[PDB]
Every structure is written in structure tokens, then in C-alpha cells.
Scaffold this active site. Sequence first.
Site, PDB file in Angstrom:
ATOM      1  N   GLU A 138     -47.644  34.897 -39.321  1.00 24.36           N
ATOM      2  CA  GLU A 138     -47.200  36.155 -38.673  1.00 24.36           C
ATOM      3  C   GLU A 138     -47.902  37.402 -39.187  1.00 24.36           C
ATOM      4  OE1 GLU A 138     -45.702  36.009 -36.052  1.00 24.36           O
ATOM      5  OE2 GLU A 138     -45.298  33.861 -36.182  1.00 24.36           O
ATOM      6  N   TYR A 198     -36.421  34.662 -27.619  1.00 24.90           N
ATOM      7  CA  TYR A 198     -37.376  35.472 -28.367  1.00 24.90           C
ATOM      8  C   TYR A 198     -38.278  36.307 -27.461  1.00 24.90           C
ATOM      9  CZ  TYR A 198     -35.900  32.120 -31.893  1.00 24.90           C
ATOM     10  OH  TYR A 198     -35.156  31.358 -32.788  1.00 24.90           O
ATOM     11  N   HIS A 253     -52.134  34.715 -31.705  1.00 25.75           N
ATOM     12  CA  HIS A 253     -51.711  33.411 -32.276  1.00 25.75           C
ATOM     13  C   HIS A 253     -52.689  32.301 -31.899  1.00 25.75           C
ATOM     14  CE1 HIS A 253     -48.100  33.833 -34.621  1.00 25.75           C
ATOM     15  NE2 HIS A 253     -47.387  34.380 -33.649  1.00 25.75           N
ATOM     16  N   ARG A 270     -32.457  37.781 -25.594  1.00 23.00           N
ATOM     17  CA  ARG A 270     -33.481  37.899 -26.627  1.00 23.00           C
ATOM     18  C   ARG A 270     -32.747  38.253 -27.903  1.00 23.00           C
ATOM     19  NH1 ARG A 270     -38.509  42.188 -26.098  1.00 23.00           N
ATOM     20  NH2 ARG A 270     -39.529  41.680 -28.089  1.00 23.00           N
ATOM     21  N   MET A 271     -32.933  37.439 -28.937  1.00 20.19           N
ATOM     22  CA  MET A 271     -32.094  37.619 -30.145  1.00 20.19           C
ATOM     23  C   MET A 271     -32.257  38.955 -30.844  1.00 20.19           C
ATOM     24  SD  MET A 271     -31.214  34.040 -31.854  1.00 20.19           S
ATOM     25  CE  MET A 271     -32.454  32.823 -31.409  1.00 20.19           C
ATOM     26  N   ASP A 320     -33.733  28.748 -38.953  1.00 20.49           N
ATOM     27  CA  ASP A 320     -33.324  29.769 -37.967  1.00 20.49           C
ATOM     28  C   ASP A 320     -32.493  30.875 -38.603  1.00 20.49           C
ATOM     29  OD1 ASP A 320     -34.621  28.534 -35.844  1.00 20.49           O
ATOM     30  OD2 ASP A 320     -32.820  27.329 -35.354  1.00 20.49           O
ATOM     31  N   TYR A 341     -43.342  39.058 -40.694  1.00 26.37           N
ATOM     32  CA  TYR A 341     -44.185  39.846 -39.828  1.00 26.37           C
ATOM     33  C   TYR A 341     -44.650  41.108 -40.531  1.00 26.37           C
ATOM     34  CZ  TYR A 341     -42.357  37.076 -35.873  1.00 26.37           C
ATOM     35  OH  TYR A 341     -41.993  36.058 -35.033  1.00 26.37           O
ATOM     36  N   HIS A 344     -49.821  40.090 -29.354  1.00 27.76           N
ATOM     37  CA  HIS A 344     -49.339  39.219 -30.428  1.00 27.76           C
ATOM     38  C   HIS A 344     -49.512  37.742 -30.064  1.00 27.76           C
ATOM     39  CE1 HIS A 344     -46.724  38.427 -33.987  1.00 27.76           C
ATOM     40  NE2 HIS A 344     -46.395  37.357 -33.288  1.00 27.76           N
ATOM     41  N   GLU A 345     -49.011  37.376 -28.899  1.00 28.13           N
ATOM     42  CA  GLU A 345     -49.101  35.955 -28.508  1.00 28.13           C
ATOM     43  C   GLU A 345     -50.562  35.541 -28.356  1.00 28.13           C
ATOM     44  OE1 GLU A 345     -46.486  34.564 -29.026  1.00 28.13           O
ATOM     45  OE2 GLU A 345     -45.119  36.293 -28.931  1.00 28.13           O
ATOM     46  N   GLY A 359     -41.578  36.277 -27.459  1.00 28.30           N
ATOM     47  CA  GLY A 359     -42.655  35.431 -26.974  1.00 28.30           C
ATOM     48  C   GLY A 359     -42.817  34.212 -27.846  1.00 28.30           C
ATOM     49  N   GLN A 412     -37.874  25.221 -26.863  1.00 21.00           N
ATOM     50  CA  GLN A 412     -38.315  26.175 -27.889  1.00 21.00           C
ATOM     51  C   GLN A 412     -38.227  25.420 -29.213  1.00 21.00           C
ATOM     52  OE1 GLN A 412     -39.613  29.691 -29.877  1.00 21.00           O
ATOM     53  NE2 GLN A 412     -38.016  28.300 -30.603  1.00 21.00           N
ATOM     54  N   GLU A 460     -46.045  31.462 -28.659  1.00 19.38           N
ATOM     55  CA  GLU A 460     -47.491  31.311 -28.483  1.00 19.38           C
ATOM     56  C   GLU A 460     -47.889  29.870 -28.062  1.00 19.38           C
ATOM     57  OE1 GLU A 460     -45.748  31.943 -31.346  1.00 19.38           O
ATOM     58  OE2 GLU A 460     -46.682  30.849 -33.028  1.00 19.38           O
ATOM     59  N   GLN A 498     -40.027  25.761 -32.087  1.00 21.13           N
ATOM     60  CA  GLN A 498     -40.296  26.405 -33.392  1.00 21.13           C
ATOM     61  C   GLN A 498     -38.988  26.895 -33.997  1.00 21.13           C
ATOM     62  OE1 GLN A 498     -42.503  30.116 -33.512  1.00 21.13           O
ATOM     63  NE2 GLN A 498     -43.693  29.381 -35.274  1.00 21.13           N
TER      64      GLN A 498
HETATM   65  O1  LIG Z   1     -38.347  28.638 -40.454  1.00 26.74           O
HETATM   66  C1  LIG Z   1     -38.723  29.740 -40.152  1.00 26.74           C
HETATM   67  C2  LIG Z   1     -38.952  29.998 -38.713  1.00 26.74           C
HETATM   68  C3  LIG Z   1     -37.869  29.957 -37.834  1.00 26.74           C
HETATM   69  C4  LIG Z   1     -38.078  30.197 -36.454  1.00 26.74           C
HETATM   70  C5  LIG Z   1     -39.374  30.477 -36.041  1.00 26.74           C
HETATM   71  O2  LIG Z   1     -39.676  30.749 -34.723  1.00 26.74           O
HETATM   72  C6  LIG Z   1     -38.654  31.149 -33.836  1.00 26.74           C
HETATM   73  C7  LIG Z   1     -39.293  31.934 -32.715  1.00 26.74           C
HETATM   74  C8  LIG Z   1     -39.912  33.255 -33.163  1.00 26.74           C
HETATM   75  C9  LIG Z   1     -40.858  33.610 -32.009  1.00 26.74           C
HETATM   76  C10 LIG Z   1     -41.102  32.304 -31.265  1.00 26.74           C
HETATM   77  N1  LIG Z   1     -40.398  31.273 -32.042  1.00 26.74           N
HETATM   78  C11 LIG Z   1     -40.429  30.493 -36.938  1.00 26.74           C
HETATM   79  C12 LIG Z   1     -40.235  30.267 -38.292  1.00 26.74           C
HETATM   80  C13 LIG Z   1     -38.952  30.829 -41.162  1.00 26.74           C
HETATM   81  C14 LIG Z   1     -39.890  30.680 -42.177  1.00 26.74           C
HETATM   82  C15 LIG Z   1     -40.091  31.716 -43.097  1.00 26.74           C
HETATM   83  C16 LIG Z   1     -39.358  32.906 -43.015  1.00 26.74           C
HETATM   84  C17 LIG Z   1     -39.570  34.026 -44.004  1.00 26.74           C
HETATM   85  C18 LIG Z   1     -38.589  34.971 -44.469  1.00 26.74           C
HETATM   86  C19 LIG Z   1     -39.018  35.950 -45.419  1.00 26.74           C
HETATM   87  S1  LIG Z   1     -40.760  35.558 -45.688  1.00 26.74           S
HETATM   88  C20 LIG Z   1     -40.831  34.168 -44.596  1.00 26.74           C
HETATM   89  C21 LIG Z   1     -38.433  33.042 -41.991  1.00 26.74           C
HETATM   90  C22 LIG Z   1     -38.219  32.005 -41.077  1.00 26.74           C
HETATM   91 ZN   LIG Z   2     -45.780  35.537 -34.071  1.00 29.61          ZN
END
Ligand SMILES: O=C(c1ccc(OC[C@H]2CCCN2)cc1)c1ccc(-c2ccsc2)cc1
Ligand SMILES: [Zn+2]
Length: 606
Positions: A315, A264, A296, A560-561, A372, A380, A292-293, A266, A131, A268, A133
Site C-alpha cells: 500500500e 471497499y 497496484h 463502502r466500509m 479484517d 497506506y 491507486h488501483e 476499489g 472479495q 486491484e 483479500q
Molecule cells: O490483513 C490485512 C488486510 C486485510 C484486508 C485487506 O484488503 C481488504 C480490501 C482493501 C481494499 C481492497 N481489499 C488487505 C490486508 C492487513 C495487514 C496489515 C495491516 C497493517 C496495520 C498497520 S501496518 C499494516 C492491516 C491489515
Molecule cells: Zn491499495
Amino acid sequence: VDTCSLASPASVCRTKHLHLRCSVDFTRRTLTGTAALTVQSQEDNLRSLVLDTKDLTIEKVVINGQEVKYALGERQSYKGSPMEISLPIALSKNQEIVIEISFETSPKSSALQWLTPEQTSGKEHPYLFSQCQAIHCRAILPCQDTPSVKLTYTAEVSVPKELVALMSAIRDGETPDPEDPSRKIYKFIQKVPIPCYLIALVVGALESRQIGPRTLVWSEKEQVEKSAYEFSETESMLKIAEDLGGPYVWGQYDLLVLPPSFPYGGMENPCLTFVTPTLLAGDKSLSNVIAHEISHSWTGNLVTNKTWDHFWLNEGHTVYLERHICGRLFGEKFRHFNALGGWGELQNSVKTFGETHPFTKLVVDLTDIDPDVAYSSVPYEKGFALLFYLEQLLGGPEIFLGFLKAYVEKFSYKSITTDDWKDFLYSYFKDKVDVLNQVDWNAWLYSPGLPPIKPNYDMTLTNACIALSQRWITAKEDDLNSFNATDLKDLSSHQLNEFLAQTLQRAPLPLGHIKRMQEVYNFNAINNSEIRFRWLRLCIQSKWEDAIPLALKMATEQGRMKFTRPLFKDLAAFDKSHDQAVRTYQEHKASMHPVTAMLVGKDLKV
Ligand SMILES: O=C(c1ccc(OC[C@H]2CCCN2)cc1)c1ccc(-c2ccsc2)cc1
Ligand SMILES: [Zn+2]
Ligand SMILES: [Yb+3]
């Protein structure tokens, strides 16, 4: 440039291709092999470059058939350690070379979860999944770990012969491993340029079943039949998404249902979406996650955020498309119901962080912030709210969907910023610039808290949820008798969930009320993960000791967090369950996903 990456930026050099040759060693919990990066100089006289790495062991770096000098710098916390490579011959602008790096991962790689046989369905074989991202690809292989660079890739992965490897790529064959007959080599090709966070790998005892003309579902055998039913609407959703976004460019759209610790809902991954098994409700009611996925495949994977500060672009637009898919399938009133629920979730997030918190801004500054830790519903739902507001301002969904499709076309295969998006919005809607100038852009994009304007929402499907929630909140003891199972007879699962979300917004309720709810509605019997989650939070927040073992079970039996984090937080906040919550975390920590273990420990202050 990208403040989350230590690598040379795209203005200096760009990775064009990765050829990954590796072996998955379950005995050592390591991935070992070579990453051959085809790199294009963007500068004259380029003599060195830097790549991101995290907990990687580097054996050697080869260019033009010879070993070259490299150096790893000191670790910079969650960013890892920069790796500077000395090029043997200075490059001119646009010149391309191949740099082949021999490396091994650490068992503690933050990109990976290594599962023992007992942690799987089949109980015989182990399992690995990645994972990456946002910034964990650097914990699998050396790379420019920034979404501002897109590359194609090929891979050859050696695994124990009884197991199957899958990647975010088209399958390109399998053969026995000539170096080790106990193993198989699986091959993969991704011909569409992607950012590296979309590189993904799973290895396990996987089986597949076809569910549409371009879709297999993959899982351990125990979950295949249920998964095939649960996600049967996938092709219908893909067709709608193509109508809204333009051609689907990735060939196949497969689904992989992971083990329960997948952190999580999902991910994508191109050609192979990863999902949590907590979607397996038995009635397809959690299918918006698949919508959603799927979405993406245009917003995120084709048009990509240039840096993580601009994550809302990925998002917000994806949630916007998701909800149009849901509205096409189930109607416009349902789209509004989900839109309004999302505003509710945004209210929750803002109240949680605080209305002036920097992580409630739409565009964030992640300088010296672990991505993270910033992650939440804000990008979102604040993103979606901005787009829904703009839809209403600009003449409605048909008009705004025309923008969406043109936006995807304009920025396909590129990585972009919020200003790029806003510039295009202004170009597309140039005849409505007067209307666009009415938006408080500084507040919407850069200010913390709830947005300055709330969109208009149809309330038809929400009304009954609010009315029932208000009955419970305002009920006194002598009113409890009036509640009955018939209260729910005209509510869909979605509406039951929204009734709980509304009520949870006012928690705690008196313990006697919550006991009566179980007496008359039997929510304990509901296995739908979204409903059970909200019900157990409501029980724990209302101090019902009987719910402690139920909430501990849910928190640990899946990972799932979205569910595990708030369940542990609520259990820690309840004095009666506090000590057990901490012990449970301590006991499970070593076998949790590494990111989940980090975040729960942070939440619990342990
Ligand atoms: O780094 C991440 C980030 C970290 C993990 C991530 O993905 C983790 C999981 C989520 C679903 C599948 N992958 C994606 C972006 C991130 C970037 C921006 C924001 C934010 C906050 C208020 S407005 C924008 C929050 C977090
Ligand atoms: Zn998404
Ligand atoms: Yb009364």
C-alpha cells in the site's frame, strides 16, 4: 512463514496452477465444482500436504484418477479449517502432480456477497461478487491461501444464461452449457502468476462500454453512461503509470463498477479493477481511487507482500505511485496537497487506535489477529509517509522514482518482506548509505504511533482550507453572520473536503455553528460521497438531530466500509440516535456483506 495460513508453506510445496470448473447456483447461494491444483513438491519424499478451507463442503479428492484420503481439522476461528490430503505416491523435490478437489461453498462464505434482484439496479436478476483479500479465497476454494505462493489460473464458470460472468483474467470465450441449456459457460485465462487473493469473480446482468484502447467499463446498464464519463481519464493514467513503473503486463485494464454494498473503494483485481459506485461524483473528482488501483498493477500485483505482516509494501508504494499520477496530471502542488491530507488521515487513525496500539505499527504481527480487524489507513499513510520522507532525504522525486522502477523490476513476479525491500533500498542507494543510516528504522518500521519525523509539505492549496476551518472553530455567536456562500467560491471540491476534514478534527463544534454552515454553504445538497461523509460526521458529532436520518440513509444505501463504519459508530455514540442505529443494523445485518456485517456489529458491540 505465514501465520494467517494453515496450509503447507512454500518451503514444502507450491501451487503452480489452478483450473477451476464451477457452477453458480443462485437458488442455493452456492458455488459448486472442482478445483484442480497443479502442485510442485519442494521436499524429498513428500507424502501429504495441507490446504486452507473455510466453510467448504468437500465431496472428494482425486489424484491419478482415483479418490484419495483427506481429513478436515477443527475450525480455527477466522482462519477456517485445515485440509490434509494423503498423497498416493511419495513425491521427489520439484515433482508436479494435479490434485482435483470436488467442493461446494456455503451461503455464508465470507468471500462472497449474494444479492437478490431488489439489491441491484435492474431489479430483475440477482448478482454475485467476490472479495478474497486478505484471507477469504479459502472460503471459495481449497488453496494455499497465502500471498507467498503465486499461480496461474484457468476457469470455466456456468451461470444462468441471461447473466454474465467476469473474472480477474482475460476472457476466453462463452458457450451454452451442454449439461443445462438454461445456462452459459464463460471461460477465463490468467497467464501471469498471481497470489490467490487476486482471484475474483462477478456474476450479474452486466453491460460494457469501451473507454480507451485497452479498457472497457462494466456495470449494470443503469450505470454504464455515468461510469464511462467518470473514469474517462483511465488511459491517461495508465500511460503515466507505465512511465513510472515499466511495462503494463496484464493485457487489458477493464473496470467494473459494483453495486453499492461493495465493501471497499476499489480492489486491484488483475485485468478487471473493481470499484465502488460511490466514486460516481459526476465530475471525475474521485479518480485518485482509479490511479491507486492502476498503480497496484506494479506494486502489489507484480511485487507482492510475502505475508500480511508486510502489507505496507503493497500500500505505501501504491499510494506513492498514485500521488505521482495525480501530480503529473494536476501538478506538484496538488501532489503535496494530497500528501498532506494523508498525514491528516494518519493522525486520525493513530488517535482512534491510540498512540501505543500495535495496529499503528508499520510492520505488524497478525498472529491470532483477524486481518479484517487490523485493516485501516495506517499501512497506506504511514507507508506513504516513509517513502515521501525517503524521497526528500535522497534527493527528490526524480531520484526516488528511479528507485521505484528498479524495485519493481527487481522483484517482479515475486513475494517479498520488509527486509527484502530495505536490503534493495540500501543496494540501490549504496552511495547514499550515510543518509540512509540517518533514518530511525526501528521507530519507522516497528514502533507504534505517528512517525518520528514529519516530511516537508508545500502548503499552497491547504492554506485556504485551514484558514476557513480556523474561522469557524474560533467564531463566537456574533461572528456567525459574517459567513457567506462566497467563502467557498475559490475552493475546489478537494479543498471543500479538506476544510471539512480539518474541522472534523476539532469536532464537536457548537450546534449553532453547524446549523449556520448548512444555512450559508448548503452542504446537505452535495452528493460527492467524500464530502457528504465528512459533513454528516461533523453534524452527528455536533449533536444535530436533523442529520440523523441523513446519516442513517448514507450508512445503509451504500456499504463502502470507509463510510458505513464511522457513520454507524457516530450514530451509536450520539445518545439521540443510538437506539435507532442499533435497530437499523439489526434489521439490515442479514442482507449486508458478511465482512461489513461482522465489523459493524463489532463496532456497535452487538
Ligand atoms: O490483513 C490485512 C488486510 C486485510 C484486508 C485487506 O484488503 C481488504 C480490501 C482493501 C481494499 C481492497 N481489499 C488487505 C490486508 C492487513 C495487514 C496489515 C495491516 C497493517 C496495520 C498497520 S501496518 C499494516 C492491516 C491489515
Ligand atoms: Zn491499495
Ligand atoms: Yb464577538
